Paper text:
The cellulosome is a highly intricate molecular nanomachine produced by anaerobic microorganisms to efficiently deconstruct complex plant cell wall polysaccharides, such as cellulose and hemicellulose. Protein-protein interactions established between dockerin (Doc) modules, located in the cellulosomal enzymes, and cohesin (Coh) modules of the scaffoldin molecule are the primary force for cellulosomal assembly. To date Ruminococcus flavefaciens, a Gram-positive anaerobic bacterium of the Firmicutes phylum, is the only ruminal species that has been shown to assemble a definite cellulosome. Finally, ScaA Doc, the unique member of group 5, binds exclusively to ScaB Cohs 5–9. This latter interaction has a central role in cellulosomal assembly as it allows the binding of up to five ScaA primary scaffoldins to ScaB and up to 10 more enzymes to a single cellulosome.
Here, we report the crystal structure of the R. flavefaciens strain FD-1 Coh-Doc complex established between ScaA Doc and the fifth cohesin of ScaB (RfCohScaB-DocScaA). The structure included two molecules of the RfCohScaB5-DocScaA heterodimer in the asymmetric unit, with each Doc coordinating two calcium (Ca2+) ions, as well as 1 acetonitrile and 225 water molecules. RfCohScaB5 displays an overall typical elliptical Coh structure containing nine β-strands forming two β-sheets in an elongated β-barrel displaying a classical “jelly-roll fold”. β-strands 9, 1, 2, 7, 4 comprise one sheet while β-strands 8, 3, 6, 5 are positioned on the opposite face. RfDocScaA comprises three α-helices, two of which (helix 1: Val-662 to Asp-677; helix 3: Lys-710 to Leu-723) are arranged in an antiparallel orientation forming a planar surface on the Doc that interacts with CohScaB5. These two helices comprise portions of the two classic Doc repeating segments, each containing a bound Ca2+ ion in loops located at opposite ends of the module. In contrast, the pattern of Ca2+ coordination in the C-terminal repeat is displaced due to the 12-residue loop insertion between Pro-693 and Ser-704. Thus, the C-terminal Ca2+ coordination adopts a tetrahedral configuration involving the side chains of residues Asp-689 and Asp-712 (both the Oδ1 and Oδ2) and completed by the main-chain carbonyl groups of Phe-691 and Asp-707. Helices 1 and 3 of RfDocScaA make numerous contacts with RfCohScaB5 β-sheets 8–3–6–5. The side chains of Val-662 and Val-666 at positions 11 and 15 dominate the hydrophobic recognition by contacting with the RfCohScaB5 hydrophobic platform formed by Ala-775/777 and Phe812/852.
Numbering used by the authors:
A (entry chain A): 740 to 877
B (entry chain B): 644 to 730
The structure:
Amino acid sequence: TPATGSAEWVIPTVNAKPGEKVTMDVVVKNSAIEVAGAQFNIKQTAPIAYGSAASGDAYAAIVPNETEQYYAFGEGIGKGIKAADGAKIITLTFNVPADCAKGTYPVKWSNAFITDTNGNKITDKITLTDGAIVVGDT
Amino acid sequence: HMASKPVWGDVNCDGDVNVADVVLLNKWLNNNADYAMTDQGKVNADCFNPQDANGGAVDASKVDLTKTDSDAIIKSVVHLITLPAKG
Ligand SMILES: [Ca+2]
Ligand SMILES: [Ca+2]
């Protein structure tokens, strides 16, 4: 009986100046599904540089491949967790070069696979909403 | 069949190694009865200090399954390592 409901996982859209370190909290919205584990890439559009990832407390501890910006979590005893609305799945820091041209630089999900407590794919039940760093001026 | 070769990390025997395998092993490690893990699954799951790291056929009743096997699987899923591991 695959976990029934849904959630939305949101990479935020933030404003930034050239030269700025940007911390992006990737958060759960309309949380209505028990998630046991997930794996996904999140990648920023150039020339924004990648800093690092840190675990959020929405679901379970993040296991990060920092070279590949490939991330995964799996609840320690295979339970599904219904995260609190707005809770952080993962937190990603980026650095905007001083010579970054004005514009929208997407930060996007890819290669997502999400599982419930019994190993069933629930990726389709999770809306994966891309964000961006919108670069302004200096 | 009394022994079988591992497909490393494929706990649920579906041909993919992903977080479903991690979740199901964690569930089984927590309580053996919560997941009907197959003999093949057991052989597949034992990827940290496995019986035979060269990948020949092994006995499912002689696997040693721990949380470190799960840790190795999740690391392999995000390409931090390749299976099998030791320590
Ligand atoms: Ca599998
Ligand atoms: Ca082992």
